[PDB]
Amino acid sequence: MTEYKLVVVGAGGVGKSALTIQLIQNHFVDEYDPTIEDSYRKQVVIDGETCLLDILDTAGQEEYSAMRDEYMRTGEGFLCVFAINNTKSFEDIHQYREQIKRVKDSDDVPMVLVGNKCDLAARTVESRQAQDLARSYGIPYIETSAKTRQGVEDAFYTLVREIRQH
Ligand SMILES: Nc1nc2c(ncn2[C@@H]2O[C@H](COP(=O)(O)OP(=O)(O)NP(=O)(O)O)[C@@H](O)[C@H]2O)c(=O)[nH]1
Ligand SMILES: [Ca+2]
Ligand SMILES: [Mg+2]
Ligand SMILES: [Mg+2]
Ligand SMILES: [Mg+2]
């Protein structure tokens, strides 16, 4: 069956693991355990196609980010995640996109910009700001909450739909 290799990247603490775990395991991880490099695999039907998602959950903490580029290298599509209550994580997106372009040696990599923790009210990144960033990259912006599940399936499936357009 069709396999899609997805890679989730972004600053430490933005909720990359919580998003992936909500998608794959249907629960919310409340605690914060920094990730090194974890992978998840699940068979799902997306738009009538049975496919296998291989999701690489990467480190956002600089300390844990050792061979991250070697992992990212294999990815077919990337979720670039920031948190809507973490302005620095949004500003950091530029450098993740540059890293993706570097590891794929392409200016045209399937990507979706994700603004996570949308269940929280300490918003410092407004939707329009993120929409504009994504527009400049030619990719979709989607807000999510790993806590409530809002947008979670949408984000990951939209990434599959972007890979399919390339
Ligand atoms: N309220 C809320 N909290 C969230 C959300 N997503 C993640 N969190 C919380 O944010 C903290 C960090 O989440 P985590 O998924 O571990 O972040 P990460 O990006 O994978 N961190 P790292 O890069 O170090 O591996 C956790 O305490 C988690 O519960 C969300 O959508 N809403
Ligand atoms: Ca929990
Ligand atoms: Mg993590
Ligand atoms: Mg390269
Ligand atoms: Mg502002």
Side-chain angles (χ1 to χ4, degrees), residues 1-61 64-127 129-166:
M1 81 202 112
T2 311
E3 186 268 12
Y4 295 93
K5 310 195 181 184
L6 313 180
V7 184
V8 183
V9 302
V14 304
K16 301 181 292 301
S17 293
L19 280 165
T20 301
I21 291 162
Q22 185 60 261
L23 180 80
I24 299 293
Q25 307 183 348
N26 299 285
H27 61 104
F28 173 60
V29 179
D30 294 78
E31 72 204 80
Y32 181 8
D33 291 331
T35 303
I36 301 169
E37 301 291 336
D38 296 339
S39 63
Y40 296 84
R41 162 178 286 210
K42 180 103 92 78
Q43 181 174 135
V44 298
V45 184
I46 299 172
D47 310 309
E49 176 182 59
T50 298
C51 48
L52 185 70
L53 302 182
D54 280 299
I55 305 170
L56 172 77
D57 180 24
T58 67
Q61 291 297 344
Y64 295 64
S65 69
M67 287 149 46
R68 191 172 71 218
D69 7 73
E70 302 311 308
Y71 291 79
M72 298 172 67
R73 227 186 123 68
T74 72
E76 294 170 329
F78 296 80
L79 280 195
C80 293
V81 189
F82 68 93
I84 60 153
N85 70 340
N86 183 342
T87 282
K88 173 64 172 167
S89 69
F90 178 70
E91 303 172 340
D92 283 347
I93 292 290
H94 180 242
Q95 309 310 129
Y96 288 98
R97 175 162 182 274
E98 292 301 312
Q99 178 174 54
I100 291 163
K101 285 163 68 189
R102 168 163 48 254
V103 308
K104 300 305 296 195
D105 299 290
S106 178
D107 293 343
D108 186 35
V109 185
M111 285 190 296
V112 172
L113 180 67
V114 175
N116 189 45
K117 310 193 180 181
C118 71
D119 58 286
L120 299 181
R123 175 184 296 263
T124 60
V125 184
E126 298 294 323
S127 184
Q129 299 174 252
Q131 299 178 25
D132 287 349
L133 176 55
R135 176 180 185 274
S136 80
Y137 297 161
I139 68 180
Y141 172 62
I142 297 170
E143 290 194 351
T144 59
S145 170
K147 185 170 179 197
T148 69
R149 292 191 55 87
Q150 177 162 211
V152 179
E153 191 173 294
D154 197 352
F156 281 99
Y157 292 6
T158 292
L159 184 55
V160 170
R161 296 178 187 124
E162 291 291 312
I163 292 164
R164 291 166 174 170
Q165 288 174 67
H166 285 55

